[PDB]
Structures are given as C-alpha cells and as structure tokens.
C-alpha cells in the first residue's frame, strides 16, 4: 500500500524532507522542493506521461510550448533546455504567433535558461519561420504585450543552415513582440539564411530590451536573402552590448548589417563585427512611430569595433502621408572601423557615415540634426576608391565632426548626376585628421567634393598631414552648389606645391557671408619707384579678398615684395615692398589668400 | 517502522542516490542532494514547521531572516526568492540594523537570488525604512563588515507607493554598509518615495561594490521628500554600469538625482536616464573621508543618455574643522544629454557641469583641479534661458573641455550678484563646437559670461558655427573681475555684423601677459600724400593692439588702406597704405585686433 | 526487499515523481530531476563511495577531474564547486596537461561554475603550476581545442601565497589553450606569485575568449618572480572588460602589467588597475603569428581607470627569421591613467604610450602604424622627471594624438645616447592640452625633446595652456635628426618671456618642405628717412623665414615698426615702418617667425 504510493508519480510527495536537518526549517516533501525548479524533461514525454528522447527524429515543439504555458500559468519561472542535448523543432506553432511563421510562443515572465542546443529540422528548409515569438495575435496592432522575458544561457540556437525558399519570405529567431523588460543573454545564434536573428519591440511599443553578451555566426549563405539585420531595436529605452557578429558568406558582404536602431533612447556598443556589408542604422521611419512617437533622439553608437564592406553607420528618417520623423541628438564615438579587402566597386559604397535617402529614394524627406561624430577611426585600404568619411546623400539638417582620424578616399562625398542634397549645420572640425592611405591615388578627384543642392551655416577646416599631389583639389564646389554663411579653410602645411586647394567653380567664396582661406599662386608686378613702392597681381580676380600674405622665401637682396595684401575695385591684390634699388620687379609669390579671417 | 521513518522529515535522509547511475560516483541521500540550494521555502513556516503561504496579510520578514542567518552559519550561499510569488514584508527589524531603520539584516557570503518580487505592506507607509541593511550595529562607526554579499536576479523590490510622512525621515532599498565585494544586479527598485534605491560603502569604507544591469522606476511621489539619490557610492573600486533610471513625478525633475561618486575610483557608465533634476555628483565631502582619505581622484562618468531637467555632472568638495576635502583627475566622456521640454527657470537651472557651492552654500571652501570633459554632447531647447555648457558657481583650481559640442544657451556662466568663484586653469579648447540652437534668443545676454572674481592661466577660444546677432557679446569680463596670464580668442566667422565680440569692461585685455585676438570695426584717415602713405585710427583706444590685420575687402581703386596694422604710444592704430592718387582718405574698416598673439 | 531497494543508491530511482502534480507532466523518478544538475560533492568520494569532507589535509584534485571527466561523456553541463566550504589541490595532473604542469584539465562543454573557494596546498610552495588547463597535450601544437568552457561564480581561486621558487618557473590560473568560446566571469583570483591569471588561446589559435567582471589582487610577492601580466589574450575576437586589478607589493611595481593583446580584434575596455608597473601591452609576436596572421589589427583599450608606475599602453612588433609581425589599426580612448606618487626613477620610465624595442632590445624591426590615442587623461606628480605622454624608443610609422589631456614632465621624449627611431605619422593635434603641474620644474628640459633619427610626415602643434619659464624650449631638434614633409608650430600665449621656443640645432627648418612657425625676439634697425621706411633685422639667420608679425606694442610716438615683415636674400628681415618724424630707429621686437604656414 504504502509502496505503491512511493512507486507511483505521487511518491516524491509523500517523503519528508527539512533543510540540513535544521529544526527550525519547514517540514517540506521532496516533491516540494524538486518543484521549485523546472525543465524541458518534465513536458518532453507521450500521452502515458513516459519521456522521449529528443533527436533529429523527434520534434520537440508542443512539449517546450506545454513547458512555457504551464509555467506561465503559475506567474512564471524559468525553464531549463538541458545541456548535453540537442532540442529540434519540426512543426510551426497555433493560434496568435501563426500570422507570424512562429515556431515557439513566448510567455510573460517565463524564461528560457537553454544551456543545451535548439536546431531546426528540415521541415523549415525553403519556408519562412520566427523561432520564438512574443505576440500573442496575428495583428500585431490587437497583440497584447510581452513582459519579464529572459533568454539566457550557454547555449545555441541553430537555424539548420537552410536557404530562403523565396525573397519575400521572412526569418527571425526571436521577436519579442510588444516586449517590455525583455532580454537574450550569452546564447550563440548560428548557421542560417535569416531576415534578423532578434527583434525587439513593434513600432515603437515596448521597453528596457537588451541583447548583450550573444553571438550571432554565419546568418546569411544565399542570394535569394534579400535583406538581414541581425538585431533590430524597434522600441525605445533598448540596446545592444557587447555582442559578437560574424559572418562568411560573400552575400553578407552586400546585404547583411549588424543593427538597427529605430526608436529613441537606443544604443549599440562595445560589440565587435566582421564580415558584414553594414555596422548599425540608426533612423525613423515614420511607418514606426505608433508606440513612441515620431523622434528618433538620444541614439549612441559607441565603443564598437567592426570590418565591414559598405557603410558602417547610416543614418535617416523619413514621412508617410499623415506622420513626418525626425532624427536628432546622436552620438558615434570611439569606434575603430575599417573597410575590409576588397576591389573598388565591388560591394556598397564604403563609408563611416552614410546619410542615406529614403526606401524609394527620395532625398527631401529627411529631418536629421544634432549628430556628434567624434574620437572614432576609420580605415580602408588604398585601392578602394568608394570609401570616404561621409556620404552625405540626402538633405541634411546637421552633423559635426570632431576628433576623428579618418583615412580613406575622400572625407565628404555625393555623387554628382544623382541625388543634390540641401545641406545645413555640416561641421567638420580642424581636429579631423586626414590619413595618409590613399595618397597617390587621387587623380582627378576632390578629397571633400561638395556635390550638393546648397550648403548654409557648415564650416570645413581641411588640415592635410602628409602630401597628396594627385588629388585635383583639397574641397571643390560645383557652380550649381550654392554656399553662404560658411566657413571654408585649408590650412597651407603639405599644399605648397597643389596647384589647386580650394576650387569654387561658381565663385561662390565672393558671398557677403562666406569666410575662406587658402593657399594660391599669384604673379605680381612693382612700380619702378626707389624705396617703398607697390607691387599689384597681374590677375583680376581676388575682389573677394580681404588679406593676403606671403608663404614663399624672398630670394632677392635688392628688393623685397609685401609681406602682406589686400585688395582693390578692380580684382588686383596690393601691397607695399621694398626697391633698395629702383626697378620694375616680377614675381611669383604663394599666398594665403584671406576672405573676412 | 521504516515507513514512519520515509514520511519523517528525515526521509529523504534514508533514500539513496548515486549520480546517473555511476558506479563511481558518491553514494549520498536524496537529503543530501536538495540540501545542496536553499530557498525562502525552507523558512517560511509556522511554529510546528507547516508552510505558510505568501501574501498582503502575511510578513514574511522573520522567515527571509531566519534563511539568511541560518545559511550565514554554515559559511554562506545564495537563497532563491521564488518566482511566481509576492513576499510582502511587514515589520522592523531588530538589533543592529534597528538603529537605520533596517528591515532585513544582510550577511557575509549570503547571496539573495530575487526571482519573485518584493513588497512593502502598509505597515510602512508614512514611516521611514531600509529594506536591506549590511550593517550589524546602529552606530556605522562601530559596525563590522559586510563582504561577499551579492543580489541578484529577474525580481523586483516594489515599495508600496507609500508618501514620506515627513521631509527628515530617511527610505534606502540596500545599504550594503561597510560593504567589500558586494552587488546588486539585474533588480527593478520601483513604485516609492525614497531617499536612495542603494548606497554602496560608508564614509570610505569598502570596496568592490557595484550595481549593473538594475532598473530605477518611479521612486519619487511627493512634496514631502525632501532629496533623492538613486544610487550613493561612498566607497572607493566601486560603480554603476549599464543600469536605467526613469521617474515620471513632478517633484523628481527638482530633486533627483541618479548617482552620487563620493570615493576614489568609481564610475558611473553605459546608463539610460528620464525624468531627473540631475545625473551624478561628483565630490569629495570631508565628512566621509575616514575610509578612502580626503581625495576623491579617478571619478569616470562616460557613456550614458540621459534627458534631464537641471544638470547632469555637479562637481564640488569641502572643509570639516579638521580635514579639507579635494576632488581631481575626473574624466567625463561620450555622454549625451539634454535638458528636457520645460519653462525658462522651471527648474534648477540647467547645465552640463556645475561647479557647486558647498551644503551651506560657500564657494570659497573647493578645491577641484585636472577634470576632463571631453567627447559629450549637450542640447536644452531654445526657450531654455537658464541652460549652460558650465554653471561656475564656486572656486574652480582646474577644468578642461576639448572636443564637446554644446547647444544651449550659454557656454560659460555665472550670475552676478551671487558668488564670485577665484578661477584657475579653465580651458576651453577651440574644438568645442557651439550650436545654433538658442540664435536670436540671447539679447542682453553674453555667451560666455564671466563673472568671477578672476580668471588667471585660462584659456577660452570662441568658435561660432553659425551667425547669432541677437547677442550682446560673444565673451564680457565685468570689471570686477580681474584677468592674468590668460588667452581670449574669438574666430572672426560668424561675427561681421557683431556690434560687440569681446568685452572687457574695465579693460582687463591690456595686462602684460594677456593674450587676445577679436574682430572689431576701426575708422581710419589717412595723410594726403600720393604713394605710399599712412593710416591712422580716429580713436585712441589701442594702446594694447600689437598687430591688426583687414576682414574687409577695399571698394576703391584710387588707393588702399594697410593690410596689417601696429600701434602708436597714444593708442592710435597705424598702418602703411597706398595712394595712387594722393589725398586724405577716411575709411571703417573690421579688423582682427590681435595682443601678443 | 522494497526497503533495501530505497536505502540502496538506487533508491531515489524508484521514487516516482510529477511536476507539480500536474497530469501532463512527465512521470519521472526523483534520480531524474536530482540527476540534472551535479556537484563536486557527486565525485568527493572515497573508493567505497563515502563522501570526503574537504580541508587543508585533503587533496581535492582527483575528485574535481573525474567529475569533469564523468560531465564531459554526457556532451557537457555545468559542475558545482559548492559555497561554504574550501576544497584544496594538492597534487598535479596527469597525461597531456602534466606539461604544462597542470592541476586539472578542463574539457570541452564543461562549465565549471565555482561558488566556494578553490586553495593551493603546500605540496605547490616553490613549485611551478598552471591551475586549470585546456591544452590536452603537453605539445600545445598538438593539442586539440578547448570549446565552450565557461568558468563562473562569486567563488575564489587563492594561490596559497607561496613564492616562486625560481626565475624561470611559469605560474597560471587559467590557460584556456586553443579555446573556442571559454570564459571566466565572477572569480576572484588571490594571494600568489604568479605569471599570469589567465591566458585565452595560443599562438592565433582560439577566439570568442573574454574575461568579464572578475578580480585579481596580489598576485605577486616576491623578487624571484620574473615578470607578471594578468591576462595575456592571444587569440582573436577575445577581450578584457569591466574588472578589477589590485597589487601592493614593491615589486609588482616594476614588474606587473594588467592586460597583454597579442592579436587582432581584441579589447580592455572599463577595468580598473591600482599598484602595477603597466596597464597593458598591445603588440604583434611574429613568433605568435600561427593561427591568426601576422597582423595585430582592431585592438581597442578604452574607458579604464588605472593608477601605475612605469607605462600605461606598450605598442610594438617584431620579426622571426621567417615572419613579420605588424600592429596597425589600434584606438585608445577614454582612459583616466594617473603615475602613483614615487621618487623620480624608481620604477621603470613613466609614459602614457610607450614605443617598444623587441625583447632583444631592437628599434628596427617594428611596423606600428594607424593608431589613434584620443580623449585621455594622464597625470604624473611634479617630482617624476621621468613622465612622458609618448615614450617614443622603437621605430614608428604612424601614431595621432586628439584631444588629450597630458599633465606630465614631458610630451614627446626619448633619451639621447640610446635608440635613434625612425618616425613617420606623428601627429600631435594642436586639441592635446598640455597640463601645468611640471611647471618650474624643467631646468635643462625639452617639453618635446625630439631624440630621433628623423621625423618625416609629422605634425606637432604645441599649445602650452600655462607659463614655464623654466624649460630649456618647448620643442628641440638635435642636428642628428633630419626633420622633412612636417609641420611644426608653436603657438604664442604664456610663451613671451621664453628665450627659446622651438630649437633645430642643425638648422632642419630651412626645408624644403617643413612648415614651422614660431616667437622669436628680434633687433631690427631702420634707415633715417621721414615718412614709409624700411626696418631691417641686424642678425641674418631668417634665410627661411617666408613672413613674420608683430607680437608687442610699440611704445613710441614718433614712429612704427613694420606690423609685418619678410626677408632677403642675405637672411635679414626687412619690413616697412612710418617714421613721422625722421631717424635711424633701433628696437627688439617679439615676432611671431612663419614658413609657409
Ligand atoms: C531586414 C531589415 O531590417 N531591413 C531594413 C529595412 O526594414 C524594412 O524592411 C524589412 C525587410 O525585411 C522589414 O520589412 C518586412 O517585414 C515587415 C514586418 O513584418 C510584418 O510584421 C511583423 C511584426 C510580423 O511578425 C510579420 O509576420 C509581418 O506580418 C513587413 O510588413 C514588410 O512587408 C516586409 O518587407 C521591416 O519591417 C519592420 O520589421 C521590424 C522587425 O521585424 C518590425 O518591428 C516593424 O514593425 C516593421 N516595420 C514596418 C514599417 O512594417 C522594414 O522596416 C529598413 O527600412 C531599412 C532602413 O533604411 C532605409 O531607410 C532609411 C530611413 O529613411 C534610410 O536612411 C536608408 O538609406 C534606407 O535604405 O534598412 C533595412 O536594412
Ligand atoms: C539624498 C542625497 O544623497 N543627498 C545628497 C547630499 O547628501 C547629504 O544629505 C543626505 C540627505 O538624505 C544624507 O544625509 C542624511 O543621512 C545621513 C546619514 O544617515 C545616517 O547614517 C546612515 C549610515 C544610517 O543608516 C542612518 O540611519 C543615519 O543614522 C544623516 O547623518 C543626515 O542627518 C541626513 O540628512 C547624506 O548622508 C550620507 O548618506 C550616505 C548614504 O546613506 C552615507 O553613506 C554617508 O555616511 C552620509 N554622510 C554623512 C556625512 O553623514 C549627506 O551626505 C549631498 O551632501 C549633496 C552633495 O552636494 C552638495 O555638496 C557638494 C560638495 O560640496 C556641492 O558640490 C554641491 O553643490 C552641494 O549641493 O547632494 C545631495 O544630493
Ligand atoms: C609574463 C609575460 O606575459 N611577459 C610578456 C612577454 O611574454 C614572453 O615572456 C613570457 C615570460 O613568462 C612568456 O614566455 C614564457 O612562456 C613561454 C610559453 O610557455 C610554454 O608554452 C605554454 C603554452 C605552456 O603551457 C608552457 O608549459 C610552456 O611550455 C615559454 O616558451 C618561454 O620560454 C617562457 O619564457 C611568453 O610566452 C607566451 O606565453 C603565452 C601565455 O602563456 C602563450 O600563449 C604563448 O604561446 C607564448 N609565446 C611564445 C612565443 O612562446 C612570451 O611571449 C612579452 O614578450 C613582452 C612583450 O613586450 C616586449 O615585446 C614587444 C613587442 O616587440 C615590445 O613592444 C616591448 O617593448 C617588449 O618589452 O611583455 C611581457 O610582459
Ligand atoms: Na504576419
Ligand atoms: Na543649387
Ligand atoms: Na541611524
Ligand atoms: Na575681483
Ligand atoms: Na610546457
Ligand atoms: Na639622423
């Protein structure tokens, strides 16, 4: 009788246990305390209640749902995935997570410790699938919410290595949903052809969602993947740290970014990347604003470390036909980014910022200000033509550049023939440096090659630190650009023998409110008149300078020209030299010229 | 007999176990297994040892206790606090921890693992509390240690919503005390009106304590409250990373603050916080100096996001009768901040860094020197009038910023009629990068606005990056405030139309190691004689003026003003022209007035 | 026969058991649940079966490895070292790891989560010892790998104190070997004589190691100890971030360093060092270059707190007969680093950023090149002569310094009558602020004493920010050391009163190509005539000079100096003054001398 009772699932039940012998401890059943734990054994069994085995055979999807919804049932807990074992997942999931290819519905305040492995069977191969999801409706609009879910572990997920089936097709490991207090923790996400490995909220509604410490191996391998972003942050007061990102594929290379981050109070850092065509967006669509409002504010990139193929941060924001978005208050600091071997042109343009037009192209949509770039580096190697600091590609409301070192191709570029960015607020500061790479390389380019609509209110201190007498200028402006209330320098160390440095091919630097300065080459002539006497440029056209003075030695004893000049009505420069003896004297002087500095 | 012995609770004693069958694994009891975790379970029950269930009407105070002092006797080791469950806690406790108002008593080696929450019962409401108490006497001076004392998990300590009953009571979350090796992670503190969440060390004392990955929500409620800390560091080695703080009451936007460094070596790093008056202080008092010595040096605030609603890092030390406190080698870097959307003087007024004037208000009391601010940026909307890159409040022996960009009112600022700070060693870099935010809203107002007492081996160079006419001055030194052995510089881009660029009301410019240079506009007449000819300035004000050199361009042809100017013994600018016709020639003229630079 | 059956080792499995008595759970024997997880006290068993109680007089190591051994053929978990007890080794390890004289061998998917305390015996007193070992071979080139190993826990690991007993000997925590995904979080490490703490892979070979949240205090004590680095990383994709670093023995100071990066893509990041001699080296081994390559690249040291004797950041790289290792692509950031209070030479020299001959003491072997050291702090007492922003002692072919702040006896030195370094690629940008606390401390001193073999492609902008009128100059060339293609300048404030400022004692530029500018005080004597007339330099050493200005007042009524001047042929300076009334005038005036800047 009695042994029956032990024998039977009860029998945990009826053998008393207290703690350490302790008299003053509960008197407790083993069952009770066994209780105060759960794993995937305890649902991982037949209709007899007798376990199974997991394996390639097995299917082991209803048991962990069985698992997730009877611990949600007693307000949570969490749920070991055994070590020792690979967990495969063969069949998609019922009811809410259905309109989202879900495999496995998370629960409130359930979490997953998997220590083991969970891979998918064959049965996904070629079909859409999210892994896990946090919706609990096929509208994610009429979806309650997700909260306290944690995902933790040594463990892995593995996506079976299967190919998309089709480019429409979606793939995701998990979506949290409409996630508040949401986390992945330590799990290795590999071997997949996948849209994202984690989502975090919907259109702005969720919070305090965090993937930190996960790494996420080789997730594209096809060209039918049209797209993947490894972590996609959609609701605010959510980051990414201190993660691992890599990836093989040559598809990754053209397609593949790290993260996204599209709500306010989001951040990336301390992670590193290798393999990827893009680091981090950081934009607003306007199609996302519902849970968080329409500005995109407080985003940081900072501390990361990457070897990428395109662009490493873009940035953006844009309208639908009743919201506009906004993107303001950035910061990308202490990255060490680098544009991996490759042929010029062989992947997307290589850049460190990418201001980037919209998913149907549009240019004047944005309404993107306050970005601080500073103490970041940035490398791509000398072969690599597309590569520059900024590819500033739609309008542009502001960005400041302070600190960096930046050696690549070129330091601003847009393409001419494309897009004719309205520009305001660009700040480039004199504490940018330039590297040395691509020196040799530039015949026939502009290293800033203002390709824009207009420039307003931007200042760009160009300070070279070696020679590069291939490059056709230091900053060219086309005659289309218009360029007022600006502050345009080049200072003259390594341009001594440049015969451009700043080029504006619609005279644009003669603006009541432009304030430039460089370096030219200027023939003069003097009065034949012993003692103090004028010497006058041949050329007529420095009506637009205030100053200008001498950067060449005076090889002459008997004469000495101006040390300094300015202007008159009709174009020449004038200055007062020297004739110890009287004579017409000719020279050719380097000169900074001044305009209102 | 066997069967009364199975159902004892020294059953699981006389069942036996061998791990997985090994043969060469030890032969224990199942006893002996369970006995290896501990939970509340094992505590919370009756007289007679029956479970009592958790609840509102139930404390469950006395039982965690008596886990906690069990578990300390047998050397340590972490208690689970079961998820699924609210544990309320209703009573004080008793002993030591009486004396702070101590709830639960805190051990050496006894780690609480929180997975369910929390709860203050009404017993508390009005009336003051700390939940956890590391100390283990009322006085801190004669208390011993807590060490190796570690918090961690997904739950929550939930402090009922209930008001302060009165402005001088004291509500704390964990006081480690005199705490070595202690942390909390992963923990929500919310739902109270409480002086801190944590306090970490006491007056110097302890070391290793640190608070990662907590969330702070909603800890302020009332007028009552008299000041809230989220988090207090009062030992050195010590610091909060990665952790979010959020409040959504009135009263917070004026009295809370997220941290306080108050030790050596401490950091606060990677945090997200809404809705504070402030982000941290950083300070030596000299009331807490028994324990770490009487400097706090190496203090790092770096890496966070925060929208506030006064200032973000406020700097300070002071004096007791025997010891001075001194506060140096401060890093704050890569933080992004804004003050949020209020009313001009809604609130304490707004700043980046405040130099702070002690608890009684005394600003001759500091000594704060080598602290870089470096890599932030800083945004107030722009009818935020009492917003500034620095409040200077107090004496100030050392502060440099190089490579911030600040978009708000002012740079520098102090009131007048207030404190008179004695100033040293302020450097402000050129790299700084000034936004456009606040043009045409400054109308009598001075950007950099210096009223000190005295300014002495300073450095501020003035660079605008973009036009704001509405200002009365870029820089005004008030005649009261002496200037030494100092550079002032404003960039002349930006400021043609500038009535006024630099001001120095009681001439203070003139000093025999002042350096300046700012634009200014001149009137000069010229002599009549054809050839090259002098110019000469109508006003005599220049007798400070070592060289000056043309911003404008010259109209005529008939002849030219000097490119570069010097000055004469009477104050007079002079300069060498040239009239290719003669006669007397009266021109304005802006100049860049330059002194020993 | 039932009850044999219960008190049997077996026993537990014919207690039946069901989750929560929930009908749809699995139906299990209490063995099962008890058999998911596992402990040290499942293998501390004598050959009978009966559990050893651990102490000082037991040696635990048998137990601990057949634990791991047993955990390891089930395809992995996580073994308990459980609180509140002290378990000692006390012998060596046997097979592969006795090579390496190993205590125990960890395996692969074996987490070792250590919650009590892990103590050497005496049996180790002057003995070599490497705790925990990966490698399974005492050939580490024959060994296989070491995956998914994850040490972790508020446990202990204590070294016993004991003393080397020789030089040579090598001691170890932790060698992960060719380690794949391992990790250490938590531990404390103490109170040894130690090589290292931790190494993470071998010679390339290994990736994805990090250590995370752990500390180590006093792990060295003796002046038999060689030399200690407490984790050397020598894989890639591997790091150091947010740990704790503590000695207070006289020799650490000479001979400890916190962190070694020996390959690409690696980090320390948010630690904090007290009472070492470095904070970390960042260096490419040619003789390490198997698994990886011979490039160091993406090596990231940033936002560290570290208070040291002799150097912070050792960059360098070296060559075999067969290979050539190179360091490129480095960024070090956020750093607060301060020399701890000591006699001037007492510890080895003390430098912000060191440039490091090889072992053998060779200068031209390195190729160091794209690094960026920006936004830093670095501070030295007045007393330490030798301090240093940039040791600069090996060849170098590029390094950029932004927007530090360095407050220290020099900014760029290396000893005279030592190596002759070839440089390229140095810049100092004008944003690094120079601190005061060395002022009058410099009698005899260069503040940048350029002992080089030659500079080329560099740039040093020096700002000084306060008077030192004891230095010998601010910049100083010896004839020795060519200087081309480089910019030098020095800026004009707190440098009147300087009798030097920037010194070539070889004349180096008058280059072709050198862009300098700097104050100096020159006598000039003009002809008689009244009206415009020409003041001329009596010495004739400004060849070179391409203009000069105006750096103080003029005193007189009756004439002007020359606001401006250039030169001629014969090395005078000649400008044009105005004499109102005429005179052969004599003045010394300070001058700002410029070359083509
Ligand atoms: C892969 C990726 O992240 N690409 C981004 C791109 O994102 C957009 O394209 C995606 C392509 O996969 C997504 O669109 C697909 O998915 C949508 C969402 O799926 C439905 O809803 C979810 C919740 C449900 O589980 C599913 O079952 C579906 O029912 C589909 O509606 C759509 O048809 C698909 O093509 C992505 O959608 C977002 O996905 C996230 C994460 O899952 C959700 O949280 C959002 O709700 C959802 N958003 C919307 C509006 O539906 C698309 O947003 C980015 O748009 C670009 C950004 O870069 C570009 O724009 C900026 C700003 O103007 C510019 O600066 C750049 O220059 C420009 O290139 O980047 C891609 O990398
Ligand atoms: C809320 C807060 O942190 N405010 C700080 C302010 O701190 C001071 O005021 C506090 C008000 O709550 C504390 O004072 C109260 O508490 C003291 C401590 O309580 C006793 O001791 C503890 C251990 C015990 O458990 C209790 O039961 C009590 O017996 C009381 O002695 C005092 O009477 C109360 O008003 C705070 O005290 C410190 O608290 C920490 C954390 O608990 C302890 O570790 C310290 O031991 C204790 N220190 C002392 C000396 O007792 C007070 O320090 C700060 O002073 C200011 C800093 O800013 C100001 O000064 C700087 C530097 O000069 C300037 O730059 C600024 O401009 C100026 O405003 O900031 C507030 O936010
Ligand atoms: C203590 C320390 O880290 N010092 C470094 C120094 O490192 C070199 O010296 C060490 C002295 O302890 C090591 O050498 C010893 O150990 C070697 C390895 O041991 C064997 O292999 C291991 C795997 C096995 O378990 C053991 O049982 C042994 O069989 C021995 O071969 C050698 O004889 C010992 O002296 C260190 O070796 C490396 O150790 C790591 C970690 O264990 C291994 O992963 C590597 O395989 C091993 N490397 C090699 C090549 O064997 C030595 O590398 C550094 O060299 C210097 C760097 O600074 C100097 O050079 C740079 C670059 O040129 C310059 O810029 C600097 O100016 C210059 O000073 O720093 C010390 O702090
Ligand atoms: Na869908
Ligand atoms: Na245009
Ligand atoms: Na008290
Ligand atoms: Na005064
Ligand atoms: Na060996
Ligand atoms: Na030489």
Same mark, same amino acid.
Not at 243 to 269: G, K, P
Not at 481 to 497: E, G, R
């Given at each position: 009788?009695?042994?029956?009772? #032990?024998?039977?699932?009860?029998?945990?039940?009826?053998?008393?246990?207290?703690?350490?012998?302790?008299?003053?401890?509960?008197?407790?059943?083993?069952?009770?305390?066994?209780?105060?734990?759960?794993?995937?054994?305890?649902?991982? &069994?037949?209709?007899?209640?007798?376990?199974?085995?997991?394996?390639?055979?097995?299917?082991?999807?209803?048991?962990?749902?069985?698992?997730?919804? %009877?611990?949600?049932?007693?307000?949570?807990?969490?749920? +070991?995935?055994?070590?020792?074992?690979?967990?495969?997942?063969?069949?998609? /999931?019922?009811?809410?997570?259905?309109?989202?290819?879900?495999?496995?519905?998370?629960?409130?305040?359930?979490?997953?410790?998997?220590?083991?492995?969970?891979?998918?069977?064959?049965?996904?191969?070629?079909?859409?699938?999210?892994?896990?999801?946090?919706?609990?409706?096929?509208?994610?609009?009429?979806?309650?919410?997700?909260?306290?879910?944690?995902?933790?572990?040594? /463990?892995?997920?593995?996506?079976?290595?299967?190919?998309?089936?089709?480019?429409?097709?979606?793939? !995701?490991?998990?979506?949290?949903?409409?996630?508040?207090? &949401?986390?992945?923790?330590?799990?290795?996400?590999?071997?997949?052809?996948?849209?994202?490995?984690?989502?975090?909220?919907?259109?702005?509604?969720?919070?305090?969602?965090?993937? *930190?410490?996960?790494?996420?191996? !080789?997730?594209?391998?096809?060209?039918?993947?049209?797209?993947?972003?490894?972590?996609?942050?959609?609701?605010?007061?959510?980051?990414?740290?201190?993660?691992?990102?890599?990836?093989?594929?040559?598809?990754?290379?053209?397609?593949? &970014?790290?993260?996204?981050?599209?709500?306010?109070?989001?951040? %990336?850092?301390?992670?590193?990347?290798?393999?990827?065509?893009?680091?981090?967006?950081?934009?607003?669509?306007?199609?996302?604003?519902?849970?968080?409002?329409?500005?995109?504010?407080?985003?940081?990139?900072?501390?990361?470390?990457?070897?990428?193929?395109?662009?490493?941060?873009?940035?953006?924001?844009?309208?639908?036909? +009743?919201?506009?978005?906004?993107?303001?208050?950035?910061?990308?600091?202490?990255? #060490?980014?680098?544009?991996?071997? *490759?042929?010029?042109?062989?992947?997307?343009?290589?850049?460190?910022?990418?201001?980037?037009?919209?998913?149907?192209?549009?240019?004047?949509?944005?309404?993107?200000?306050?970005?601080?770039?500073?103490?970041?580096? =940035?490398?791509?190697?000398?072969?690599?033509?597309?590569?520059?600091?900024?590819?500033? *590609?739609?309008?542009?409301?502001?960005?400041?550049? #302070?600190?960096?070192?930046?050696?690549?191709?070129?330091?601003?570029?847009?393409?001419?023939?494309?897009?004719?960015?309205?520009?305001?607020?660009?700040?480039?500061?004199?504490?940018?440096?330039?590297?040395?790479?691509?020196? !040799?390389?530039?015949?026939?380019?502009?290293?800033?090659?203002?390709?824009?609509?207009?420039?307003?209110?931007?200042? #760009?201190?160009?300070?070279?630190? &070696?020679?590069?007498?291939?490059? =056709?200028?230091?900053?060219?402006?086309?005659?289309?650009?218009?360029?007022?209330?600006?502050?345009?320098?080049?200072?003259?160390?390594?341009?001594?023998?440049?015969?451009?440095?700043?080029?504006?091919? /619609?005279?644009?630097?003669?603006?009541?409110?432009?304030?430039?300065?460089?370096?030219?080459?200027?023939?003069?002539?003097?009065?034949?008149?012993?003692?103090?006497?004028?010497?006058?440029?041949?050329? +007529?056209?420095?009506?637009?300078? +205030?100053?200008?003075?001498?950067?060449?030695?005076?090889?002459?004893?008997? =004469?000495?020209?101006?040390?300094?000049?300015?202007?008159?009505?009709?174009?020449?420069?004038?200055?007062?030299?020297? !004739?110890?003896?009287?004579?017409?004297?000719?020279?050719?002087? *380097?000169?900074?010229?001044?305009?209102?500095?």
């Amino acid at each position: 009788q009695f042994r029956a009772i #032990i024998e039977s699932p009860e029998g945990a039940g009826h053998v008393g246990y207290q703690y350490r012998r302790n008299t003053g401890s509960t008197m407790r059943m083993v069952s009770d305390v066994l209780d105060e734990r759960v794993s995937l054994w305890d649902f991982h &069994c037949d209709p007899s209640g007798n376990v199974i085995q997991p394996g390639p055979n097995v299917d082991s999807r209803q048991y962990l749902q069985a698992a997730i919804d %009877y611990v949600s049932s007693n307000g949570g807990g969490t749920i +070991t995935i055994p070590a020792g074992y690979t967990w495969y997942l063969g069949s998609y /999931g019922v009811g809410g997570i259905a309109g989202h290819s879900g495999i496995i519905q998370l629960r409130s305040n359930v979490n997953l410790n998997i220590e083991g492995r969970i891979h998918l069977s064959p049965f996904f191969d070629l079909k859409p699938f999210q892994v896990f999801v946090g919706f609990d409706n096929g509208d994610p609009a009429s979806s309650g919410n997700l909260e306290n879910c944690h995902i933790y572990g040594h /463990g892995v997920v593995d996506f079976g290595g299967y190919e998309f089936g089709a480019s429409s097709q979606l793939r !995701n490991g998990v979506a949290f949903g409409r996630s508040y207090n &949401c986390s992945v923790t330590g799990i290795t996400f590999q071997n997949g052809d996948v849209t994202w490995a984690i989502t975090l909220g919907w259109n702005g509604y969720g919070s305090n969602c965090y993937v *930190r410490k996960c790494r996420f191996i !080789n997730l594209v391998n096809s060209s039918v993947n049209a797209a993947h972003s490894t972590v996609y942050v959609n609701c605010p007061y959510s980051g990414v740290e201190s993660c691992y990102f890599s990836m093989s594929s040559s598809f990754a290379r053209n397609i593949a &970014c790290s993260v996204e981050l599209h709500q306010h109070d989001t951040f %990336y850092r301390g992670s590193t990347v290798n393999g990827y065509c893009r680091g981090a967006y950081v934009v607003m669509h306007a199609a996302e604003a519902a849970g968080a409002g329409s500005y995109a504010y407080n985003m940081q990139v900072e501390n990361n470390i990457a070897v990428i193929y395109g662009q490493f941060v873009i940035l953006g924001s844009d309208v639908t036909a +009743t919201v506009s978005g906004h993107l303001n208050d950035v910061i990308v600091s202490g990255n #060490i980014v680098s544009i991996g071997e *490759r042929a010029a042109f062989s992947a997307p343009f290589g850049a460190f910022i990418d201001i980037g037009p919209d998913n149907s192209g549009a240019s004047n949509v944005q309404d993107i200000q306050r970005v601080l770039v500073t103490g970041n580096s =940035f490398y791509a190697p000398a072969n690599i033509t597309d590569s520059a600091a900024i590819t500033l *590609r739609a309008n542009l409301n502001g960005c400041t550049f #302070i600190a960096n070192n930046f050696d690549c191709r070129y330091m601003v570029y847009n393409a001419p023939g494309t897009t004719s960015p309205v520009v305001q607020n660009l700040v480039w500061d004199k504490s940018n440096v330039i590297g040395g790479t691509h020196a !040799n390389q530039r015949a026939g380019q502009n290293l800033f090659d203002m390709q824009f609509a207009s420039v307003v209110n931007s200042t #760009i201190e160009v300070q070279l630190s &070696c020679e590069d007498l291939s490059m =056709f200028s230091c900053i060219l402006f086309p005659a289309s650009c218009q360029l007022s209330y600006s502050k345009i320098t080049v200072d003259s160390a390594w341009t001594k023998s440049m015969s451009n440095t700043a080029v504006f091919e /619609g005279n644009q630097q003669a603006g009541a409110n432009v304030y430039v300065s460089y370096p030219a080459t200027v023939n003069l002539t003097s009065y034949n008149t012993q003692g103090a006497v004028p010497f006058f440029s041949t050329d +007529t056209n420095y009506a637009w300078v +205030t100053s200008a003075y001498s950067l060449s030695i005076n090889e002459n004893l008997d =004469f000495s020209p101006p040390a300094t000049y300015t202007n008159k009505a009709n174009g020449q420069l004038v200055g007062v030299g020297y !004739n110890e003896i009287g004579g017409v004297r000719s020279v050719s002087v *380097r000169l900074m010229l001044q305009r209102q500095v």
